[PDB]
DNA sequence: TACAGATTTTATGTTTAGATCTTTTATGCTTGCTTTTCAAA
DNA sequence: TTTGAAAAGCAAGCATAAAAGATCTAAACATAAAATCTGTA
């Protein structure tokens, strides 16, 4: 019984707790670019411990 | 230092801002470049600037604004608190609002003295919640606790404040009180028990609660039961001004 | 793999418990008894983090060590092969 | 100085209603005061309303913890959505003492304070219709100082904020009172999120422990709808025959009526009476819903009234369905203006109609009664009821075509214009970014007049150098960039324009005047940006890095 | 003045709110090497 | 269609911020006997 603004916020935060800062842009960002640029490449190899 | 970001707002432009700089990329650009300023000079210019540039227009929307003025008591009457925004110091908007204007209209409109305006100065470090309701007691003169209703080391304020909500549900409704909250996101009024004790308050329909807000992330400080017993309508009043009454209690040499 | 029911995470939740009744674990950087009633008025006062989190992320440590629990299950136990890494 | 004090009194010095006059001012102030009359009475006929539905909730509410309450364990209710604000009644039952305690999480910081508390509440209770230890002896010794039995109701108000290990503790400590044969132990847990998310902070002996007869009871207002669609109904009665309701409106109440939950009634009375305030405080027109004010009827009431697009198209239709021009012209007024003003416009007594059938004759009772008037509305009121596959045979007594009627944009509720979202739901940070940003829409362009003409508000000025730039910022860089938008010969122009300030003549002629200007400028920004919480020094000591920390659009 | 009763003074116990310092751990910066997508031929 | 090359990634080492709490103080809350002050008598 929680709002849906409540429901993703929580799951926002579990996000944010569980994923380092520094791959978002290598998942969340979509939007077309005018300025040349790149985005984050990703993580390379993955960890063998669920975080 | 105009970013090298394709994006500017919006989560794009969060995640396309936060990238990592090399050290050679960096620049080791110090304060001991800047040209020294000592504070009688920043104080005169800083007068100086404030006193004649864009004076004016702010004078002028200044004037736009107390058009307002009938809206705000209007809201006020019929229980809402109001809550001012914007850019810039809302302080003289408020002690011009309230006492200037509302304090002669709640008192002309409830037919002799006016009707008292309690200031509290958030923008003040020692602004002292048990003080503040010291000056409440004053003004209102509530009943004192019972022994029943003190329980058992409570909090005599919270319990008289809730003593006061159940006295003030079956009285007139007509205003004694106008509290005037210049910062209520302050450095010592934002805390729980000062936010706590100010929505019990609002929760009382015989005091007018007129409040303003300065950092970006105020709406934070308030959850459901609070914005409840707050009751808040939200007027952006953004006049850019200089804010020099509240900034005497910070360093501006740092 | 080489029959023993895996049992559930709500299930192994009262093992668990069963087992820091029992002293086999000890929460992590923990006091335990104070010495003196006026230490432990001050700490009774105090909210510990490790009261707040989720159970199953609280850190804990081990009474008895893997060499121990070797020394001591004798050899026909059905998980003796597994006190070795 | 009271402006450097912590608190103040003001006894204001005195040298009558804040209606103002409609019209471009034109309007009479008979017509103000009939204004704040009518929405006075229309206030009063919601509220009245208002109020008897919220003491019937704690009626009833209070009802059903009575029921549940009564009729060697604990006795466990769970309130699952509860707030706890209600006030729990316990009876007289003679030869017994039921003794009820309120527990709060500030006045649970461990055992020893929850034990102390209740056992004083219970030795107060018990005395108030030698002193002792405050402690679980008492509860053994009951039935010997007061002769008779004991009947402990517990009541933990917002368990999801107390300390879990302290509850655990004190439950295993209440267990002890079970081999006392004059004792039992009732237990109310408030619970605001779920219970699988309690017992996961309990342990499982304790769950084994309060398994043994437990009741749920959902005591939320949202459950059932059965609150909201009184209070909604009770603004329809209200307005009935006044005025109507847009879809725009409605879709706007279910909107923001989803995204609170646990305090979603007082939400609806808080938008539905500012919606009538601002109806009654910005139309002329609200004098109208009284007949008697008909021979009120001035130029500006028709000139206000024929730009109304239903008229529009009434008349063009009439040019349509007329060939003649000459009874085109005379309408092109007041008397038909009247005699449409006082249609019955029975969509509110056909939704109660819907709603009583629904309820009472259909055994339905999940239903919105918000969402049913917003797909009557719109006119889909068959696809709001297919859904329960019992409203098939009904499917054709239950319908309903909107009658688009003539000047009832004149008596409505909308939101076209934001002001409902301005004043009650406000996009709080982007409003401040967007002041910051452009600056022309708050400061007038008006046409010192050179400097304000071509240079911008510092603080705007700052935000559009702060936007641009990357996470952290040099400090020193950003005075660079901030000194470069400056023009320098205007600025040391707007300084000498005041002969009678000697000291800032004598700083203006220094080589070094115009960065010194500038500096103190910027730094004067800087700290107006750091008390807003815009930027952030990561440091202690040195003040030479900033971080950003809010970003326009988030 | 006499004296019961109310209030103050002095003295101490109970509970909560908050400050400061210590110990251990997270976190960010630097520097050198390695992978990877996009601007251009 | 390649290509190459600068952006991104990664990790070892280290200086430093910060979390968690041990320890303590002070204010609010609470009680209580002896002395002292008040109001009648």
């Known amino acids: 019984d929680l709002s849906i603004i409540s429901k993703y916020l929580l799951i ?30 990703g993580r390379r190899k993955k960890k063998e411990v669920n975080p | 230092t105009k970013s090298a970001s394709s994006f500017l707002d919006t989560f794009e432009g969060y995640f396309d801002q936060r990238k990592i700089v090399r050290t050679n990329a960096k620049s080791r650009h110090t304060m001991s470049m800047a040209p020294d300023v000592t504070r009688e000079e920043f104080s005169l210019v800083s007068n100086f600037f404030n006193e004649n540039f864009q004076k004016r227009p702010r004078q002028k929307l200044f004037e736009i604004q107390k058009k307002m003025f009938p809206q705000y008591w209007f809201e006020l009457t019929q229980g809402f608190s109001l809550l001012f925004y914007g850019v810039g110091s809302k302080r003289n908007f408020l002690e011009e609002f309230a006492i200037d204007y509302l304090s002669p209209k709640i008192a002309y409109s409830q037919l002799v003295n006016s009707i008292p305006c309690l200031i509290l100065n958030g923008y003040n470090p020692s602004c002292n919640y048990r003080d503040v309701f010291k000056e409440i007691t004053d003004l209102l003169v509530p009943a004192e606790l019972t022994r029943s209703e003190t329980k058992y080391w409570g909090n005599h304020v919270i319990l008289q404040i809730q003593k006061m909500i159940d006295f003030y549900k079956n009285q007139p409704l007509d205003i ?79 | 793999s080489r029959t023993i029911k895996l049992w559930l995470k709500k299930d192994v939740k009262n093992v668990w418990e069963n087992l820091v009744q029992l002293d086999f674990f000890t929460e992590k950087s923990a006091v335990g008894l104070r010495d003196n009633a006026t ?29 121990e629990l070797r020394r001591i299950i004798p050899k026909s136990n059905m998980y003796y092969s597994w006190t070795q890494l | 100085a009271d402006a450097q004090r912590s608190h103040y009194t003001v006894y204001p010095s005195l040298p009558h209603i804040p209606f103002v006059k409609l019209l471009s001012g034109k309007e009479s102030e008979v017509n103000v005061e009939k204004r704040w009359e009518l929405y006075h009475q229309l206030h009063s006929h919601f509220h009245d309303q208002v109020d008897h539905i919220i003491d019937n909730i704690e009626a009833d509410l209070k009802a059903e913890i009575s029921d549940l309450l009564y009729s060697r364990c604990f006795n466990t209710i769970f309130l699952l959505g509860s707030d706890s604000t209600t006030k729990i009644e316990l009876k007289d039952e003679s030869s017994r003492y039921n003794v009820l305690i309120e527990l709060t999480p500030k006045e649970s910081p461990n055992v020893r304070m929850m034990l102390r508390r209740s056992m004083y509440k219970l030795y107060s209770a018990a005395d108030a219709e030698n002193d002792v230890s405050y402690d679980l002896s008492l509860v053994e010794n009951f039935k010997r100082l007061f002769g008779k039995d004991l009947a402990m109701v517990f009541n933990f108000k917002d368990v999801d904020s107390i300390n879990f290990n302290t509850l655990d503790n004190f439950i295993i400590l209440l267990k002890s009172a079970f081999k006392y044969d004059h004792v039992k132990i009732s237990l109310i847990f408030n619970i605001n999120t779920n219970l699988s998310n309690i017992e996961k902070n309990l342990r499982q002996s304790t769950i084994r422990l309060l398994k043994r007869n437990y009741h749920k009871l959902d005591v939320s207002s949202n459950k059932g709808f059965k609150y909201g669609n009184q209070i909604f109904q009770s603004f329809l009665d209200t307005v009935d025959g006044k005025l109507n309701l847009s879809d725009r409106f409605v879709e706007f109440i279910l909107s923001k009526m989803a995204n609170n939950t646990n305090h979603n009634l007082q939400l609806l009375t808080k938008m539905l009476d500012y919606s009538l305030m601002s109806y009654f405080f910005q139309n002329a027109f609200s004098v109208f819903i009284d007949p008697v004010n008909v021979d009120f009827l001035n130029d500006d009431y028709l000139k206000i009234l024929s730009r109304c697009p239903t008229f529009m198209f009434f008349v063009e239709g009439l040019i349509k369905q007329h060939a003649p021009a000459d009874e085109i012209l005379s309408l092109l007024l007041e008397e038909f203006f009247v005699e449409f003003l006082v249609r019955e416009n029975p969509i509110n007594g056909h939704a109660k109609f819907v709603a009583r059938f629904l309820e009472e004759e ?28 019992a409203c098939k045979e009904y499917k054709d007594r239950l319908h309903f075509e909107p009658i688009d009627t003539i000047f009832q944009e004149l008596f ?35 046409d010192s007049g050179d400097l304000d003409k071509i240079m911008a508000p510092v603080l705007g ?13 040099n400090i020193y860089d950003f005075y660079i960039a901030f000194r470069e938008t400056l023009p320098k010969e205007e600025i040391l122009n707007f300084i000498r324009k005041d002969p009678s300030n000697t000291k800032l003549l004598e700083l203006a002629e220094t080589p070094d005047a115009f960065d010194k200007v500038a500096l103190i400028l910027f730094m004067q920004a800087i700290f107006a940006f750091e008390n807003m919480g815009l930027i952030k020094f990561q440091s202690t000591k040195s003040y030479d890095l900033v971080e950003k920390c809010v970003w326009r659009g988030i």
Not at chain 2, 230 to 245: G, K, M, Q, R, W
């Open chain 4, 362 to 389: 259909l055994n339905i009772t999940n239903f919105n009664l918000i969402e049913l008037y917003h797909n009557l509305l719109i006119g889909k009121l068959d696809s709001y009821l297919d859904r329960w596959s």
């Open chain 1, 12 to 41: 926002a935060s579990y996000i944010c707790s569980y994923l380092e800062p520094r791959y978002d842009a290598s998942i969340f960002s979509r939007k077309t670019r005018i300025i040349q640029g790149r985005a984050a490449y």
């Open chain 4, 461 to 473: 000025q700052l935000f559009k150098l702060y936007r641009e730039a990357n996470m952290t910022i």
């Open chain 3, 39 to 67: 230490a432990a008025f001050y700490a009774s006062n105090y909210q510990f983090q490790g009261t707040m989190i989720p159970f199953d992320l609280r850190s804990y440590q081990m009474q008895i060590i893997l060499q």
């Open chain 2, 176 to 254: 004694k009180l106008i509290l005037v909250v210049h910062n209520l996101d302050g450095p010592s009024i934002r805390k729980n028990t000062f936010q706590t004790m100010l929505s019990f308050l609002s929760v009382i329909r015989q005091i007018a609660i007129v409040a303003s807000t300065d950092h970006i992330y105020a709406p934070l400080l308030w959850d459901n039961m609070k914005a409840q017993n707050y009751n808040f309508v939200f007027h952006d009043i953004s006049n850019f001004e200089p804010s020099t009454v509240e900034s005497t209690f910070q360093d501006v040499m740092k």
């Open chain 4, 412 to 446: 409505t509720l909308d939101n076209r214009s934001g002001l409902l979202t301005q004043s009650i739901f406000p996009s709080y940070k982007s409003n401040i970014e967007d002041n910051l940003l452009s600056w022309e829409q708050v400061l007038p362009s008006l």
